[PDB]
From a paper:
In [name], the K+/H+ symporter [name] of the [name] family is inactivated by c-di-AMP. The c-di-AMP-sensitive, high-affinity K+/H+ symporter [name] from [name] is particularly required for the uptake of potassium at low external potassium concentrations in acidic environments. As a member of the amino acid-polyamine-organocation (APC) superfamily it has the classical LeuT-fold with the first ten transmembrane helices (TMHs) adopting a 5 + 5 inverted repeat. [name] is a homodimer, stabilised by the swapping of the cytosolic domains with respect to the transmembrane domain.
[name] in DDM was additionally incubated with a ten-fold molar excess of c-di-AMP after purification. The two TMDs are tilted towards each other, forming a dimer interface at the extracellular side that would enforce a bending of the membrane by ~130° against its natural curvature. As speculated for the preparation of [name] in SMALPs, the tilting likely was caused by a loss of lipids between the TMDs during purification. A comparison of the resulting structures of [name] in DDM and in amphipols with the previously reported structure from SMALPs25 suggests that all of them represent a similar inward-occluded conformation. In agreement with this, a strong density for the bound substrate potassium ion is observed in the 3.3 Å cryo-EM map. The potassium ion is coordinated by Tyr43 (2.9 Å), the carbonyl and carboxyl of Asp36 (2.8 Å and 3.3 Å, respectively), hydroxyl and carbonyl of Thr230 (2.9 and 3.2 Å, respectively) and Tyr377 (3.2 Å). Each binding site is formed mostly by the cytosolic domain of one monomer: One of the phosphodiesters of c-di-AMP is coordinated through two hydrogen bonds and a salt bridge between the non-esterified oxygen atoms and the amide groups of Gln581 and Ser582 and the guanidinium group of Arg337. Only the second adenosine moiety is coordinated by residues of the neighbouring protomer; it is stacked between Val457 and Leu461 of TMH 12 that extends out of the membrane and Arg337, located in the loop between TMHs 8 and 9. Arg337 is the only residue of the TMD that engages in a strong interaction with c-di-AMP, making it a prime candidate for the transmission of the inhibitory effect of bound c-di-AMP.
Numbering used by the authors:
A (entry chain B), B (entry chain A): 22 to 163, 167 to 196, 207 to 606
The structure:
């Protein structure tokens, strides 16, 4: 259960070092708006990205040591920056998860269509299909499938880089007009979408070896080095071959095809890239609940997320995350180019907030060597904020959804916090002992003389006396037959048959319950209803059974403050 | 509650006579594939459609008399053709409802964009938005809004027809190569999508005046005459002005603009058409549950639909119908042209089955004048089957989804029927009285000393003795504080504190429940758990509260055959 360095790197790096499939492509797409001759500018810009990457790693190398409990960006932003910055970081992490699912799936389908161009008319269905698949694979459960594909991806891309560099060596500057500083910055910001998951390792510190902090930091350093090597090699290869971004083929696919030649090696590369992107999406799915629990300990998210041991909130979280990702995929049509700016925003707001909190914490404490750590975090935060500002300013026509999504989730967090605050305020205070109860009348609603009915009557009689059976009859003809059949049973239970012409079920019970509750209140008795819970071993018969019980519970019995037992009954 | 003829026509005709907005358009679109000079062929084809319409009306004029209880196509296909034809009719009616929602909404948005061309880039969002709106308006409840717009539509289109005919009179043959018989039949089949809701009146016979059959038949005849007049007038006007189908404007919009001139009259026409199409979609929504109940009486659909008086199944039905319609809208991009063939298939399978059943019933009985009724139904069935065959053969690339949807729903119906058959078989048989119970031990899970906890303890003590409180503690530190606070309460209840390191909640309860259940079984006691049901008056705090209770119920207590009371507690 204590992952070693290699296995931990495999399980947690599938999000970060899987972004090399669409980073250099973004850089080249932005540069191509001027001319194909500007592609050499990818070489410096890429270097700048690595510089940023270095800062991030160093910054997070601090965070892991400062917060060995885990937490990550949310905790750092909460403790050191207050409550609103922490909530903003949480919302941005939610956007990060939704967008990493969407972007990873879209890029995977782009890789697949590059492998088989005949599916270019099904970019969106395939994508959505894949999403649903992993949703199921997360509802069903779910460890080897998350560890080998990353090794395969790293090995395959290292082989591809080596072969491409060898071919370039065997042969198998220049300023260009139009490139202004602003467009260079735009390209750099778009290319910073290669640093889209270095967060993950800092969020899973406990699942490490005996020293958790040291092992996590060394794993993060190794992952950073691997990502830097892969990204630099891919960018160098792309510059070497030219490889302008085609509208129906990824840059990696073009590089592989011009290197190996659409043979088994190329298909291996494409399949492995698709697999690693799917694993990245699954990483987003699996990383959401950790954030949910971290928020829920502070009463910002439902208490149902605080039970982490039983995966209480995993179903709702997985369903909501999958549906949000599907909605985003449909909205942008699976265009990885049009989705990446939003993903970068959702990733870089937490980066900025986390580095700012780190810097202010260092300022507050001022330990030995505080100046260097402060400088590193400050530089990282400045660069990240610049990238975020550029992404807002330029690609607003695809970043508009975050400007709507952030206020909604922040307000939801505040509303939940206020609600739990009020509830905890007025519930903790204890009070006087309630009115005495001298007995209990049990009402058993019956839909027909069955085995389940007789079992429930038996338990009701065991529980207390005064048991009365109640039957709402939709037709006056079957009243006599049902009453006779009940009399055939030798139960000493008074049966009250009451009629409803309009096939309604609540209102006749409303009247009867009024009468019975008044009568019981005269004798200080507590009315109580005993429903059977028919259970079958199919998990899809739930809609087929005992729904009238839920109707009566929800619409009548909760409003009347009446105990409602639910005796289960299994089916063979 | 007993609708008069006029009000009934208004409430039920919003589906049938709202199809004039896209029938002549389909005829013209099919004819335009040859040349604009072939548009005169719309005049004969339209006439043929009316002939078909006449048959349908006559056929249904019989059905209303033969089945005054209602039912409609499903009952006719069930009694006279067997079980599988009845199920096929039911599935096709489900497709009819989904497609009428989708098509009506799409045509409404087409009318809106014709009114304001600036929204042509939002055909699908607007559409989906409208759908969601009516979904809400069907979950909230929902009678005058369903009665006046139909009157407005009829009046407005009658005015438009009169004005257009007047202008044609004041002036304000010719065989064409390429028109083969097959293409004429294709155009006729596509134009038969004007008869897309004459079914509705036959499905709501009881809600009429003192003679239900006569009043329903006369209302159906009046609606048929109105539809014939509107459709014929629209087709004549379209032929008179030429009005080739533009890619960004409905034929009705073109007719109105060339008649009135984009003034307040034209905007009134467009708005009224949009309103009538929205009402048609709402008619589909409201008509689904009648089919659901009719199926459920025969154990083909969940029993939860048999309680028609309390609208038990309306929530699930509305949600599923809305989501299916939204999926179809997105799939075909709100192209009313591409959706109509599927709608016509889903409407005409029931027409064919119903007329065939009517004919065979007449053959079996052979009453006076049987020959004429048999001939009418036979002719209607033959024409409908021909139209359906043509729609399958030609427009397969948009009718493929029904070929997938039909087997799934038919198999679901059969599976549900088999399941209820087995359950009813093995449940009715009564058996020996179960083991005696000599008392009851009550387990009260507590999450902290609160008012709710003390109320639940009070009720548990009232219910029986041997009450024991149980607390799972996620941290050993707060164990002592919680135990001391419990001791501060003077409850004579033994508190068992048990610890779970991984924040799990089921497993410690699993062990404790094993021990307690064994101990109680030694004394023939029945274990029982008492949960509080925290209730707030906001309907959206449901996710915020008492979810651990649902976790414990679902994952632990149903599997152990243990009674689980649920005492409600209201919030102030
Ligand atoms: N003959 C049969 N064929 C198929 N399934 C059968 C069946 N008899 C019982 N069941 C299954 O058992 C569930 C509970 O049956 P019971 O009548 O004990 O429990 C009923 C009864 O306690 C009460 N209830 C239902 N209809 C009622 C009525 N018309 N009048 C009074 N109480 C009614 O609500 C509970 C829920 O009933 P619901 O029908 O939702 O759920 C039923 C159904 O799922
Ligand atoms: N201080 C507070 N702040 C905000 N809301 C509060 C609150 N105290 C109680 N509530 C509300 O009351 C519900 C039931 O509280 P109770 O502890 O009686 O009912 C609990 C208790 O009977 C049992 N349970 C929950 N956690 C437990 C634990 N750690 N150990 C043992 N039983 C537990 O499951 C029931 C469901 O509890 P859940 O927390 O889902 O739902 C809670 C929550 O919605
Ligand atoms: C809950 C309320 C909050 C807001 C409501 C929810 C959103 C409402 C409208 C959203 C959709 C409107 O916008 C609709 O979708 C996208 C917008 O990105 C457009 O489509 C375009 O999206 C982006 C833009 O380059 C591309 O990736 C895509 O290929 C392109 O087709 C559609 O042509 C437009 O019709
Ligand atoms: C059971 C698992 C299998 C999955 C089942 C679900 C199937 C998919 C559900 C609906 C998918 C909708 O797919 C929708 O199709 C429309 C056309 O109708 C596509 O159509 C559009 O695609 C993009 C823009 O978005 C353009 O390149 C293309 O020219 C345009 O036609 C949209 O890209 C997609 O949003
Ligand atoms: C509660 C508040 C609600 C929030 C806002 C509600 C709706 C907001 C959705 C905004 C629409 C998205 O904006 C979307 O942008 C893309 C380009 O990026 C447009 O895409 C379009 O560009 C041009 C210019 O219109 C079109 O001619 C072309 O057909 C298409 O590619 C979509 O037509 C537009 O819909
Ligand atoms: C339990 C599920 C069982 C399997 C379900 C059946 C599988 C269905 C596969 C869905 C494939 C999606 O199909 C996708 O949309 C339609 C099919 O109508 C095709 O294209 C169609 O819609 C497009 C896009 O709106 C329109 O231009 C036009 O109406 C038509 O060409 C798309 O080119 C195809 O990409
Ligand atoms: C709160 C109520 C408001 C509704 C909120 C929901 C907003 C809508 C959710 C996503 C809608 C998706 O809208 C999707 O946009 C894509 C482009 O991205 C559209 O794009 C496509 O439209 C059709 C083909 O389908 C072509 O005419 C168009 O050229 C093409 O771009 C698809 O038609 C539509 O399937
Ligand atoms: C159980 C699994 C069920 C089978 C799974 C697949 C179900 C059927 C989906 C495949 C057919 C999709 O439906 C079909 O999509 C193709 C591909 O866009 C569309 O094809 C049309 O548009 C595309 C896109 O421009 C053109 O390339 C093509 O030449 C043209 O014919 C058809 O108009 C649509 O009818
Ligand atoms: C337009 C497309 C046409 C409509 C789509 C196709 C409709 C028909 C396809 C479904 C046919 C189902 O075929 C049905 O399968 C169910 C599954 O248990 C079984 O149905 C059988 O159920 C049990 C025995 O098991 C018998 O009580 C019942 O009388 C019998 O019908 C039989 O195998 C067959 O009756
Ligand atoms: K990534
Ligand atoms: K219609």
């Amino acid at each position: 259960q204590k992952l070693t360095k290699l296995k931990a790197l495999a399980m947690l790096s599938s999000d970060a070092l899987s972004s090399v499939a669409y980073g250099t492509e973004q850089i080249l797409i932005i540069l191509a708006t001027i001319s194909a001759a500007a592609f050499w500018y990818s070489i410096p810009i890429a270097v700048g990205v690595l510089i940023l990457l270095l800062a991030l790693i160093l910054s997070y190398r601090q965070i892991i040591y400062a917060y060995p409990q885990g937490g990550g960006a949310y905790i750092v932003s909460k403790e050191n920056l207050g409550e609103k910055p922490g909530l903003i970081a949480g919302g941005s992490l939610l956007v990060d998860y939704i967008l990493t699912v969407a972007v990873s799936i879209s890029a995977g389908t782009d890789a697949i269509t590059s492998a088989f161009p005949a599916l270019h008319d099904y970019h969106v269905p395939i994508a959505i299909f894949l999403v649903l698949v992993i949703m199921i694979l997360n509802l069903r459960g779910l460890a080897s499938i998350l560890a080998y594909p990353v090794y395969l991806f790293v090995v395959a891309l290292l082989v591809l880089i080596a072969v491409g560099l060898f071919k370039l060596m065997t042969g198998q500057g220049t300023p260009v007009a139009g490139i202004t500083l602003f467009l260079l910055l735009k390209a750099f910001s778009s290319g910073c979408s290669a640093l889209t998951g270095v967060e993950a390792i800092s969020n899973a510190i406990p699942a490490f070896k005996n020293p958790p902090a040291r092992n996590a930091a060394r794993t993060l350093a190794m992952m950073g080095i691997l990502l830097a090597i892969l990204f630099s090699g891919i960018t160098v290869l792309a510059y070497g071959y030219g490889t302008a971004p085609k509208p129906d083929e990824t840059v990696v696919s073009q590089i592989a095809s011009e290197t190996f030649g659409r043979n088994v090696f190329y298909y291996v590369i494409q399949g492995v890239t698709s697999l690693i992107l799917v694993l990245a999406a699954n990483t987003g799915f699996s990383a959401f609940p950790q954030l949910a629990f971290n928020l829920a300990r502070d009463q910002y998210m439902p208490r149902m997320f605080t039970v982490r041991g039983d995966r209480l909130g995993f179903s709702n979280g997985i369903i909501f995350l999958g549906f949000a990702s599907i909605v985003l995929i449909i909205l942008f049509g699976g265009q990885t180019e049009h989705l990446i700016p939003l993903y970068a925003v959702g990733v870089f707001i937490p980066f900025t907030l986390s580095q700012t909190g780190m810097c202010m914490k260092w300022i507050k404490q001022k330990p030995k060597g505080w100046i260097g750590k402060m400088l590193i975090n400050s530089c990282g935060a400045l660069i990240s904020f610049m990238v975020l500002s550029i992404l807002f300013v330029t690609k607003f026509n695809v970043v508009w959804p975050v400007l709507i999504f952030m206020p909604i989730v922040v307000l939801l967090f505040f509303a939940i916090k206020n609600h739990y605050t009020a509830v905890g305020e007025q519930l903790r205070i204890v009070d006087k002992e309630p009115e005495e109860i001298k007995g209990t009348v049990v009402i058993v609603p019956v839909a027909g003389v069955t085995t389940v009915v007789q079992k429930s009557i038996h338990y009701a009689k065991s529980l207390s006396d005064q048991v009365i059976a109640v039957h709402v009859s939709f037709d006056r003809e079957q009243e006599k037959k049902f009453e006779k059949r009940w009399e055939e049973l030798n139960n000493g239970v008074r049966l009250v048959t009451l009629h409803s012409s309009y096939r309604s079920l609540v209102h006749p019970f409303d009247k009867f319950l009024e009468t019975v509750e008044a009568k019981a209140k005269k004798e200080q008795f507590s009315v109580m209803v005993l429903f059977p819970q028919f259970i079958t071993k199919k998990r899809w018969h739930t809609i087929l059974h005992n729904q009238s019980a839920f109707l009566l519970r929800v619409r009548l019995f909760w409003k009347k403050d009446i105990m409602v037992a639910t005796l289960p009954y299994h089916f063979k």
